[PDB]
Each structure stands twice: as C-alpha cells, then as structure tokens.
C-alpha cells in the first residue's frame, strides 16, 4: 500500500507489483498464517514428514526454516479448522463433531497435547461443511470479543457461545435474519464488523443489491439495510465479496470483485469515520470540543511516503491499526476563537511476545490558534512539540537518535541504565540473555525520552527549538527468583533541560 | 486464555499488571484481630512492574467451608479487602468456587476511617421472558449499589470482616 497523492491526503493506492526479493523454497504443502501469534505471518510447511516455518520479519527478510516442536497429525485432516478456542488469541487446532470437539492448544512453537472435550447437557454442535443449506462458521456474533460458533440458515441464526477450552454453551437464537427459504444460498452470506464494533453483522449478497443486517450486540438483527449496486454491476457465483480496511478508516469497506473478461472492482464505503467514537462535548457555557480520529495506518502511510522521498527505508512495527486522536479542536463560543491540536504519530509498535501494544515511539503535537476574524493580524504563531517515548523495542528506540534536533556543542545524550539490587546496592547490569533483555526493555515502555518545543514562526531560527528536554531512565531488577519474568522497577534517573529560546548559541 | 482456576493461573493487580508470588506462603487464621474461623494460606504478591511498591496478599483457606480473599497494603498504610463476601465476587454461577474477580469490598485508613462497598447481584428482573429464556443464569455480574463511608466511630479493622452487612 502507498499514499496516493500528497502527504496528509487520506487516499490509498498500491504500487506496481514487484517480485519479492526473497521467498521460501518450499511451497508445495504450505500456507501463510501467523502460527505463533507474533504479528509476523509464517509460511508454514506441513509436508510429507517435514514440519516447520519461515516467519516474515518487519524488515522484509525471512527467517530461516524453523522446525515446529510439535504438530498434530490431524493438522492436515479434511475437517481441520483453526480457531481461537483457548481464548489466547492464538489459532488452535480443532475438529468438531456434534457432541464433542478435539482441541489442540497453540503453545506458540507447536501445539499442546490435545484433549477431547465433551459438551455438557444436550448441547449439540453444528458441524462445518455438513449441510449445504446453511453456514457454519466461527465469528463474534455475540459481540464479546471471541470466536463463537454460529450457524446461519434461511430462517434463523443460532449461536453457541464459546466458554473456553473447547466448551460451548447452549445455542442462542439471534432472530431478525430471514431469507426466502429456497433462495438461501450460504455462498451469499458474509460476516463483518461493519460498524467497527464488537458484534459481527450479517451481509447477504443478492445479484443486484446487498441486504445488510446490523447486529444488535448479540441480541438479534436489525431490519436489513438495502444497498443497491451501481448500474452495470451484477453479482454472481464467480464473483467475490471481499472486506478490508483499504482506506485507513478502521471499518472495512465492501469490495465487489467481478472477474469478467476485463476484471474490475467496486468498493462501497459505508463510513468515513468509526461510528462509536466520542465526537463532541459541549458544556453549555460556551466551550465546545471536537474530536477527530485517524487510523494509525494512515500515519504509517505518511511516514512511509516521507521516507520514500528521502531515500530511507521506514519500518512499521504495528500491523494492528488503531484509531488515534487527531485534530482535537476547541471552540470558544462567545469569543469566536478556536484552538486546534493536531497529533501526528510515528514508529508505533506491537510487542509480539506479550501480544500487547507498546505505544508510539513518536508523538508530534501541533498547536494552532485560529483567532476570530477581525481580531488580530495573525498574532500568536502556531507551536509544535515533539515527543519521543520509549517503546522498549530497541530497534525503534535506538533509531530515535537520528530524529533529534542537533547541536554538536552539547552534552552527551542518554541511554537507559540497567541495574539490580544486590545487598541493597544499585549495581550495574548487562542482561544475561534475550529473555531478560526483553523484560528490561519492556519495563521502559511509555517513558518520555526526549521532547522539543518549537515555534512555527517565519523567522530565520524557526528550526531551532525554544527548549530541549532529555531523560535517562533506569530499570532495576529486584527479584529474578520468580516465574521467568523478573520483578522490575523503573524510574527516571536523569533529567536534562536546555533552554535555547530559538538561539542555537 | 480462559483461566483454569487450578492455581496455574496468574492475576492482574489494581493496575493491569501481572502479579507474581514474591513471598513464601504462611499459615494464618486471625486478621486484624478477627478470627476468621479457618486457617488460610497467605501468599504474598508483587506486580511484575513495580508500581509504587504496593503489597498484595492472597488468602486461601485450607477448608472448603470458606472462600478466599485478597488484601492490599498500600504504601500509606491504607488497607483494602477485595472479594470476600459473595456480593464482592464475580464467579461462575454454577461452580461458585471459580472466582474470576475480587471486587473491592472494604477499606480502612491508617487513621481509622472506613469505606464499605455494597454490591448488588444481577437478577432476572426488569425484562422480557425472552431475555431470561436464552440467558438463564449469567447472574455473576455485580453492580456497585451503595458505598458506605464515614464510619460513625473509629476502627482499625476492615468493615467487611466477619461478613457483617452494614446498617445505614
């Protein structure tokens, strides 16, 4: 994906296809899936005796073949499906029958010895692929953040909540969905988080229109919203409805791919904003606040585009788009003045190992005063504050060193200090291995490492900050005699201020 | 993943950090002078990331006739009790020993001031038969109903001890 148009545009395009410079050689019995749940897709090979994978790293390289530690022989079974059943967010291996399931937990290096889970009571599960008249699939139709088992037929939607480790609860009827009996072809049923929220909506595709049933938080369906196709577009069995966030809007758009003689595509945008976010506040005393949001993925495209234009190779460490706050605006009803803060983000990252978001390494805050018309001749120039934070992923933190305002006649910058606590002394430490190094760096996440304040003036010294602030943090290992991760404590040891007042000297 | 409830699980603190066992367990039956009626294994906990050095204890009875609880010892001597009485617990409505959450129930200051939190359990009211029909239990949810504070008299003990419901 590339930024289409100028930087700051929200438009998205794709570049001319290029061969990837490197691919795995073994592609006869393999597929691309995140097997570890690390955020890195794995080319996973499960061939005639050979089991392992190649992960796709963020810098574009591939790892060498990594053997799996354990794989069920049933991985390749015709009814094998993967699903999040342990609730770990990992894809577990499961086989489903009507009375029991067989579950192999994903241990993120292979799978665990599986277990046969007997369903309690009289709970009978649907079996995927068993009946062409209905759809059996995993989906968050209850809007709870998990993979529930849902069966969609012409007259009703039934769902068995996932209680974990292969256990399912009683079927829940989710009324409101209804198709004309014999016309109900499951091939026409697609599921989606169209409002960007928990519950997954049911989209029924007809030849000339979409019949969309909004999901009322797992309590049944809304009367369908009918959308019509543009003239000349008709849907059929050779066509496909694809859903994806391809705009940087969070909410996936509906793409109709019609491969006929000259393959063409259409996209239906239902929203330009994620619909449940807080938009406005008004205190009825003249203060009005407007929030705006922008997907993190659009900041990435701007970051990427800027790097391309300077010959640099940007790396995104966040494959899981979030909506960040952008362009907060405060309106003074009564004075007529407005104040807008635009945040720009860069270098954010996903932890991978603990499956958590570490945060944005860089946050840049503008500050613009819109004085009431006729008030003043553009007085009070806009300000800019740059803030660099630790992510605790020293592939990013180490790189922030080049983005700082430079002054050669300056004190040495800071690096984090790692210590322990030995006979009550703050003893310097170099981590023994990667597991410790990881946890020591994890402890740094979110700390401000540096900030700079600039005026966005038209002066000859507009690029020189008024102030520069540097910090040095420290992580102390207090108790390693524990479950593998040690107890760490962290704080700021050094804080250095510089006052330039835009004068470099 | 979904908790096993077999002590292989970990817990999150008052801040969503992982708690770890820091101290060897000890046996105790008396809490702030209150004889709880059972011997509890008391396990000390710390956050993996040490926010303000708060210390936590998990009290686990050796008997099936009692439920567990958590205590928090704040750096200022403030002491908190979470999840002791059943209204303070979120637990599997069937296997009720599977407590998912321990909600703050009581708190005592270092100077004798107290707070007691009265929770109300969810129930089958305020709705249509259809709501109940497809969701027969799920009464594990707890809502804060009344927070009682400003004890008329002074006490160094937690107000929730002995399971005594507050009077206004």
């Amino acid at each position: 994906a590339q930024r289409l148009g100028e930087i700051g545009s929200d438009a998205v395009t794709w570049e001319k296809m290029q061969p990837l410079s490197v691919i795995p050689s073994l592609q006869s019995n393999a597929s691309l899936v995140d097997i570890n749940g690390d955020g890195q897709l794995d080319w996973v090979i499960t061939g005639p005796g050979l089991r392992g994978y190649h992960s796709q790293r963020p810098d574009g390289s591939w790892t060498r073949f990594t053997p799996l530690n354990a794989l069920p022989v049933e991985y390749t079974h015709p009814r094998a499906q993967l699903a999040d059943l342990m609730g770990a967010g990992l894809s577990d291996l499961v086989l489903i029958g009507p009375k029991s399931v067989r579950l192999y937990a994903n241990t993120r290096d292979g799978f665990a010895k599986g277990k046969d889970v007997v369903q309690s009571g009289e709970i009978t599960l649907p079996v995927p692929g068993a009946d062409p008249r209905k759809l059996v699939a995993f989906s968050d139709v209850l809007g709870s953040g998990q993979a529930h088992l849902v069966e969609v037929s012409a007259t009703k939607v039934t769902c068995w909540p996932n209680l974990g480790r292969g256990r399912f609860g009683q079927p829940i009827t989710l009324p409101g969905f209804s198709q004309p009996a014999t016309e109900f072809n499951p091939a026409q049923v697609y599921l989606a988080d169209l409002d960007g929220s928990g519950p997954t909506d049911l989209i029924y595709v007809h030849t000339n229109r979409l019949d969309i049933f909004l999901n009322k938080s797992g309590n049944g369906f809304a009367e369908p919203v009918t959308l019509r196709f543009p003239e000349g577009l008709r849907f059929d069995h050779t066509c496909q409805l694809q859903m994806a966030d391809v705009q940087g809007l969070g909410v996936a758009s509906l793409i109709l791919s019609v491969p006929h003689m000259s393959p063409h595509h259409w996209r239906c945008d239902l929203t330009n904003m994620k619909p449940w976010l807080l938009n406005e506040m008004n205190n009825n005393m003249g203060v009005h606040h407007t929030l705006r949001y922008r997907s993190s993925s659009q900041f990435w495209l701007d970051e990427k585009a800027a790097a391309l234009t300077t010959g640099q190779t940007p790396v995104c460490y966040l494959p899981f788009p979030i909506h960040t706050l952008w362009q907060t605006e405060t309106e003074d009803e009564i004075s007529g003045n407005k104040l807008v803060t635009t945040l720009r983000y860069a270098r954010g990252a996903w932890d991978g190992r603990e499956r958590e978001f570490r945060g944005f390494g860089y946050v840049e805050q503008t500050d613009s005063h819109q004085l009431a018309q006729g008030n003043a001749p553009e007085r009070t120039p806009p300000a800019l504050t740059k803030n660099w934070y630790a992510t605790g992923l020293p592939v990013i933190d180490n790189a922030l060193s080049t983005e700082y305002w430079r002054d050669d006649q300056a004190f040495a910058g800071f690096s984090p200090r790692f210590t322990t606590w030995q006979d009550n002394k703050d003893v310097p430490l170099t981590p023994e291995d990667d597991n410790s190094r990881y946890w020591f760096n994890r402890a740094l996440k979110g700390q401000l490492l540096r900030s700079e304040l600039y005026g966005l003036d038209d002066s000859t010294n507009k690029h020189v900050p008024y102030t520069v602030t540097e910090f040095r943090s420290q992580v102390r290992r207090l108790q390693h005699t524990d479950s593998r991760y040690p107890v760490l404590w962290s704080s700021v040891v050094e804080s250095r201020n510089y006052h330039y007042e835009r004068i470099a000297s | 993943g979904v908790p096993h409830y077999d002590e292989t699980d970990t817990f999150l603190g008052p801040e969503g950090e992982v708690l770890v066992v820091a101290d060897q367990p000890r046996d105790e039956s008396t809490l702030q002078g209150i004889n709880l009626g059972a011997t509890f294994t008391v396990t000390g906990y710390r956050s993996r990331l040490e926010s303000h050095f708060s210390r936590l204890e998990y009290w686990q009875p050796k008997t099936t006739g009692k439920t567990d609880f958590w205590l928090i010892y704040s750096p200022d001597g403030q002491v908190h009790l979470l999840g002791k009485s059943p209204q303070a617990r979120i637990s599997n409505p069937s296997q009720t020993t599977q407590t998912a959450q321990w909600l703050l129930e009581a708190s005592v200051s270092s100077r004798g001031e107290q707070i007691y939190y009265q929770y109300r359990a969810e129930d089958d009211t305020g709705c249509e038969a259809d709501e109940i029909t497809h969701h027969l239990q799920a009464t594990a949810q707890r809502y804060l109903h009344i927070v009682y504070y400003g004890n008329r008299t002074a006490s160094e003990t937690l107000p929730g001890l002995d399971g005594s419901a507050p009077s206004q």
Partner: peptide, 14 residues
C-alpha cells in the same frame, strides 16, 4: 487509574 486492551482480528485459513 486506567486500562487498555488492544483488540486484533485473527483469521484462520483452514
């Protein structure tokens, strides 16, 4: 204080 969980969607291939 506060809390956050980042929710991502994982898609199986079968």
């Amino acid at each position: 204080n506060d809390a956050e969980i980042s929710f991502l969607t994982t898609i199986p291939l079968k």
